[PDB]
Each structure stands twice: as structure tokens, then as C-alpha cells.
Design a protein around this ligand. Structure first.
Ligand code: NA
Ligand code: NA
Ligand code: NA
Ligand code: NA
Lengths: 445, 445
């Protein structure tokens, strides 16, 4: 009937074939077949990643791996509520116009010169993507880009549009790498291997600061924009007012608590998920101040991402319970011994960066982090390096518009060519592979 | 600054006063103060009920009652996912126009006579409210009511409008009482005292069938409509097509599995939350058939209700853990001994029915079911009768437009008077009190 339905049926056939024709233990066979089924579903997007995540507990229970409540309890992890609080913050900013105010103030700090407005556009895009999202950030920044570029004759200077546009999209995708919020893959890794907000920040903030300038330089030295004119924005200067200040103060307090959780928590009793508690407190403070309402929060939040978090966690639990992780570790011990950690991370980064171009970053991270984590635990090899590397690589999607929402959004303008986008993404992917490998070897080891 | 903020501050002061000036055990004092705080917040709607629910785990953790993960695990109960699957079903029906088709076919079964079209309008409204919702049902039925009543001269026959309108609203509110889905209070009671879909159906289906005709008769004998004309609907007759049939088949299969879970589950291994598994399977089947997509499901679903379920469950757990339930039971043992179960249920039903007029049905049920349940467990007195009675009474809101969304929606037309609505709701509330008391004493004991 449809390609998606045929893919689902073929995946079912593959599951049955592995179930009946695998000479391993029953539990290992079940886990491997389930892993292949979920992998095909997520990568091919035959069903929505959230629907597949909902399926994971169902076929875990029906095959006698977990009880229903135990399987469903993976959907209430503290990380999910942390990222819900992140959604609440972003909804408040959008409702109050804080993001627009910040962008306008930065572009005002640019007097009239487009030579610097584009670069500060990239910087503010990354800053917003730390907190709000990768998609909404690019969506709201695009009109600003077009307004700045309204006087540059977009028939003969299309290279400048490609610059200011792909830079914004990549800046959003990279700013999502700096914070636990901003990119769902970071949440998946943190949930898998117990990473706090500041623990992830110490990992992803230098990476983002070192990759964004590299991406901009690659763009500039691949395609040559002029960047010598001036821009006179027609939009009026939006000023500060009550509610924006309160939202900014709540945001700053929440960030301060997230950063200094460890001393604060040590001074309050030692709560287990203080970051999640702070996120919920942020929700409560915003509601009390009446700067955002639950209807806006609900509309802004992507609950499918949270359900996908739960599904990935359930898959990791299934792999750990069935012995599939340790079985794969025993199988791969010889290979990993022959070829060392440097090349292990090299190939992992290459695979993830070149896979997220075709597959969703969140689904790819949810699929791979459990595997390389539970397997790594069987090697010892604390599964923080691989999980964080996989999340960052998944966030690093640059070659195709379908790869990432902001890429598609910026491609919708019509001023960008498939060939140019693919080649720029190729060079950036190679550079990101090198940078991530070096970072993991040096700073993390 | 604002009444809501002042209410929150006064509630904080009350919490501190109870915390410092209660001569009970520390845990009992903490539980009682927390109960009062949450009660005031929910009843006054100073903060959104969902926000208060999110607050419940936060102030449970910060006061050393539960660990963060244990407190948050109450938000992943199987009941929540059951009602999520109900949302998925409703979204599919709305997307495919199944509800509109059903209503049109029924009104076609009425040749042209409004004497019976109104009554079948009530019946179909209740049937849809069993599954879809109380609010969306009335919202989509109202245009049909106005179309039927477009030829009745709404300046001198306003009584007929009040009839056909309040009947639709009450029919929706009552149809929500027949199934576990349809009314969040039913979900709260089922989660509290482990009730299956058919277990609740055996409770709420006779109640709805016995209350809806009573409500219609009270309406007819209080206000006198003519109901002698004819209606010629301008809208074209929408016919069946591929996708509606598939959605109807999936809905029927899901209902069949929900009804016959106990034999089926006994024949498959004895899964713990087979109803929730069936709901998730319904989501999967709908997605596979491509009759609904996650974006429509997300837009349709009210995730605040699910979070409120989690918050109420956490409150019940807090009461059980702190000994507040047993302390209240010991305090009230003398009173409940002096005055028997008949009058206990009488006063409980009176309080709930006359409270849901001012307070949201879901929040009132979430507040009261934990109290009268955990307290009842301390008496023995299996807390099914009281929980189900409270849920039904909460669903029974008829006096004020602000009481229930469908009441407000039907009041938005402008053909209904506050005085008439209040008096009709008063008589219906009295009759519902009597009916619920009799049902609980006779069928349940
Ligand atoms: Na982001
Ligand atoms: Na992608
Ligand atoms: Na309903
Ligand atoms: Na109400």
C-alpha cells in the first residue's frame, strides 16, 4: 500500500527471522531482534519516532522482559521534567518577546554595518539555541536575516544569502550542543549516564565555542560573500517593559542554580535530581509571576520528544536486562582490542555525523547511546565519552535540508542550492569529526 | 498585585501557621499543611491545576517525604497512558470526521421531526462523550443544535433553545461518566483504587443511563418547549469513505479488548495493565493505518490533565506515607460510628456536587479521592464506593457556566439565562444526589 507500511511489514519479518534463526540465548536473541526492529523503525521514520518509543514498552512487556508499570516508569525520569522546564522557559521568552528584544538590541549594537551584523546574528542564534530550541530559533531568526539582506540584490549576490542563512542554521544546531537543554540528544545522554546540567556544560560549551567559528570560517572560505553594505531595518526598536525583566530574572536565577547545584545541593541536604527540581521551580516561578500560562507551555512543548526519551531509556533497560549488552561486548572485545580507542571514536563520530544527515538526530542518539553505553559498561569504559560524542555528532547535521528542521526551514527560502549545501556540509562534517575526536582524546581520554 | 498572587501568599502563610502551630507528629503536621495548601490552590485556581500538581512533588521532595525519582514516578502510571490512548482515538475520529458522520446519520434517521432530533442529539452527545471528551463533544455539537433550531424564531421560543442546549451540555457531562475515558475524574479514581475499564463501566454505565433521562425529564417539566416543527438541514450528507471505516474498526477492536480484557489477559499470561497496553496498541494501529498523526494527537491531547493525575497520585502517596490518612481515620472514627454510611455518602455527594459548580471537576476529584480513599483504607471500607461516587459527583456540574467547559461553551451562544441555568442545575443536583446515594447503597453497599 505505502512505503512506510511495507517497511513496517518487512521489519516484522526481519524480527521473526532473527527470533527463529539466531543460535544464541533466548534473552539475547529477543534483545537483538528488538534492537534491529526499533533501529529500522527509527532510522526509516516509517512510524513517528514517538510512536516507536511507545511501542518499545509494549513489545518489552508482551515478550516478558518487564512488567507494565516498570516499563512505563522510564517515561517519568527526572531528565524529562528538566527538559519540560526548559520548554516552559522558552515559552515564556517567546510569549514576552525576550528573544526578539535580545536580537534587536544586538543588531542595534551593530550601528549599520552588515559585516558584523551577520556574525552577531550567528552568535545570538547560538545563544538562543542553548535554551529555546534549534528549530524555533532559526524560524524566528530567518525574518531578521531577510530584513538585513533586503538591500543586497538576491539574484547576483546569492552567496551572501547562503552565508547568512546556513550560518544561522548551523549556529542554532551548534548552540543546541552547549547546554543539556537545546538538543534532545543531550538529554538522552544525560539520562543514560547520569550527567548534571553543569556536567554537560563543561563538555559541550567548549565544543560549541570551538566549532561555531570553524563552521563560519569554512563557510566564508568556501563561498565568498562581500559583506560591505549597510542595513536600515524598518522595524521599530522594541523596548524593555514589565514582564520581560521578570522573565529574564527568573531565567538568570534558574541558570545560576543549574550551574551551582552541587554546592547549593550539598548545602541543602543532597537532593538527587536538583537540576530537575530547579526546572520545576522555574515553572512555578513563571506561573506565579504570570509571565506565561500553561496553554502556551503546552503549545510550545514537544511531548513526543519526552516520550521518545522514555522509549530510549526503556530500550537501554531492555538491553541491560537481557544480557545483550554484555554479549555484544564479549563479541566485540577482540575487535576493540585490535583497534584502539582513538579509531573507535573516529569511526563512531564518522558514522553518527554521516547518519544524522538522513536520520533524525534525536532518534539516532536514542538508538545509539544505549548500545554504545551498555556495551561500554561491559568493557568498563565509563560510557560518558561515547554517549556525549554520539549526542554531539547527532546534533552535527549540515548536509541536507531534511536532516534537521532549521536546515529545512532555511532551505524553504529558495536562495540556497542543494549542491552548495551538500558540499559545505561535507567539509564541515569532516572538520567536526576531527574536532570531536581531538576533544575526546585530549580533554576526556 | 493580583488576587491570584495574594491567594498564593495567603496559602503560604496558612501553611506556615499549620506547620508551626499544630500539636501532632511532625509527619502528620507536614501532610495536613501540604493538604491544605494544595486544596486552596486547586479550589481557588490561583495557579493552574497542572502547575499545582507539578508543585506537589517539588514540596514533597524538599520536605523529605520522597526522593525525586520516586515522586516523579507517579506521573508514569498506566492509567495516564490509557487516557493518552483515549486522546489518540478521539484525535483520529475528529481528523476523519467520524463524529460528524455519526451525528449526521442519526439526524438523518430523524426524517424531519425536531421532536425526536433533540433527544437523539442528547443520546449521540452522550455516546461521543464516552470516548472523545466533554468539551470537544459539546463544541462540535453546538453548530448542529443551532442548525436544527435555525427555524424556531429565537426571541419568543428561547425555552426550546435552553432545552436543546442545556440538554446537550448535560448529556456530554453525563456521557463522560459512563467510561473510564471521557472524564478525568474517572481516571483519577481508577488509578487510586485499581479499577479496570470494564470495572468502571459496570459502575458508570447504568448511572449514566439512569441519570440522563432524569435530566431530560427535569428540563422538560421545568421549562416547557414545544418541539413540534421540522428542520431542513442545509449541510450536505457526508458519506462513508476509506479511513473512517478503518478508524471505526480500530475503535471497535479497542473497545472489545477493553471489555474482554480479563478473559483475554488470563489467556495470554496475566499482564498487569492490559487496558493500558490495549490503549497503546490502539495508538500503534492508528499510526500504522495512517488515519491520524502525532501532530494531531499532540494538539488534541491535554497533557495538563495527565500531569494533574500524577500530582494527585503523589498527594495520595504523601498522605499514606506520612500517616495523615490513618490519623484522620482515628479522629473521624467516632463521627463515622455515630452517623452511618448512608448519611456519609449523602453528605459526600452533596458536598462534591455543590463544590464542582465552583471548582474544576478534575481538581476537586484529585483533591478528594485521595483523602476519602486513604482515610477509608484505614477504616477498612474498600475505597471504591467513595472514590467512584466522588468522581461521578464531580462530573455532575450543572448550575454555572464557569463550572464546566461545555456549560460555558453552550452559554456563549447568548440564548440561556443565568437564573434558569442555576435553578435547573439546582433541581438536577438534588436529583443526582438522591440517585447516587441510592445506587451506592443498593448496588454497591
Ligand atoms: Na536548541
Ligand atoms: Na537529522
Ligand atoms: Na467525555
Ligand atoms: Na467544575
Amino acid at each position: 500500500l505505502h512505503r512506510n507500511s511495507l517497511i513496517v511489514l518487512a521489519d516484522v519479518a526481519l524480527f521473526l527471522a532473527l527470533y527463529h534463526f539466531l543460535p544464541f540465548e533466548h534473552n539475547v536473541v529477543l534483545g537483538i531482534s528488538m534492537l534491529a526492529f526499533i533501529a529500522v523503525l527509527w532510522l526509516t521514520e516509517a512510524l513517528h519516532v514517538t510512536v516507536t518509543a511507545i511501542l518499545v514498552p509494549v513489545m518489552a512487556v508482551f515478550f516478558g522482559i518487564f512488567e507494565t508499570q516498570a516499563a512505563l516508569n522510564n517515561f517519568a525520569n527526572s531528565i524529562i521534567f528538566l527538559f519540560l522546564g526548559g520548554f516552559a522557559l522558552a515559552a515564556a521568552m517567546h510569549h514576552q518577546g525576550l528573544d526578539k528584544v535580545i536580537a534587536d538590541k544586538v543588531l542595534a549594537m551593530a550601528q549599520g554595518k552588515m559585516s558584523v551584523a551577520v556574525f552577531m546574528l550567528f552568535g545570538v542564534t547560538a545563544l538562543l539555541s542553548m535554551w529555546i530550541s534549534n528549530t524555533a530559533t532559526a524560524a524566528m531568526m530567518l525574518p531578521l536575516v531577510l530584513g538585513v539582506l533586503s538591500k543586497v540584490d538576491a539574484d547576483k549576490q546569492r552567496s551572501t544569502y547562503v552565508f547568512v542563512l546556513l550560518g544561522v542554521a548551523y549556529s542554532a544546531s551548534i548552540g543546541g550542543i552547549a547546554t543539556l537543554v537545546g538538543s534532545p540528544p543531550n538529554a538522552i545522554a544525560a539520562a543514560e549516564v547520569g550527567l548534571s546540567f553543569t556536567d554537560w556544560m563543561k563538555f559541550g560549551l567548549p565544543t560549541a565555542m570551538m566549532m561555531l567559528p570553524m563552521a563560519i570560517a569554512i563557510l566564508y572560505f568556501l563561498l565568498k560573500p562581500t559583506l560591505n553594505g549597510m542595513f536600515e531595518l524598518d522595524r521599530a526598536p522594541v523596548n524593555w517593559d514589565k514582564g520581560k525583566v521578570v522573565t529574564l530574572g527568573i531565567f538568570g536565577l534558574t541558570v545560576f542554580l543549574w550551574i551551582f547545584s552541587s554546592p547549593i545541593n550539598a548545602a541543602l541536604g543532597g537532593f538527587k535530581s536538583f537540576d530537575t527540581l530547579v526546572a520545576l521551580g522555574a515553572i512555578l516561578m513563571l506561573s506565579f509571576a504570570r509571565v506565561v500560562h500553561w496553554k502556551e507551555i503546552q503549545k510550545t512543548a514537544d511531548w513526543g520528544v519526552l516520550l521518545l526519551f522514555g522509549g530510549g531509556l526503556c530500550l537501554s533497560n531492555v538491553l541491560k536486562q537481557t544480557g545483550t549488552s554484555v554479549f555484544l561486548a564479549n563479541a566485540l572485545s577482540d575487535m576493540v582490542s585490535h583497534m584502539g580507542i582513538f579509531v573507535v571514536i573516529l569511526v563512531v563520530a564518522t558514522f553518527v555525523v554521516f547518519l544524522t544527515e538522513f536520520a533524525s538526530n534525536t532518534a539516532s542518539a536514542a538508538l545509539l547511546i544505549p548500545v554504545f553505553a551498555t556495551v561500554a559498561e561491559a568493557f568498563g569504559m565509563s560510557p560518558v565519552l561515547l554517549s556525549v560524542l554520539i549526542a554531539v555528532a547527532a546534533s552535527c547535521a549540515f548536509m541536507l535540508p531534511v536532516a534537521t528542521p532549521p536546515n529545512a526551514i532555511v532551505f524553504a527560502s529558495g536562495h540556497i542550492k542543494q549542491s552548495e549545501m551538500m558540499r559545505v556540509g561535507l567539509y564541515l562534517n569532516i572538520a567536526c569529526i576531527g574536532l570531536l575526536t581531538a576533544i575526546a582524546m585530549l580533554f576526556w581520554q
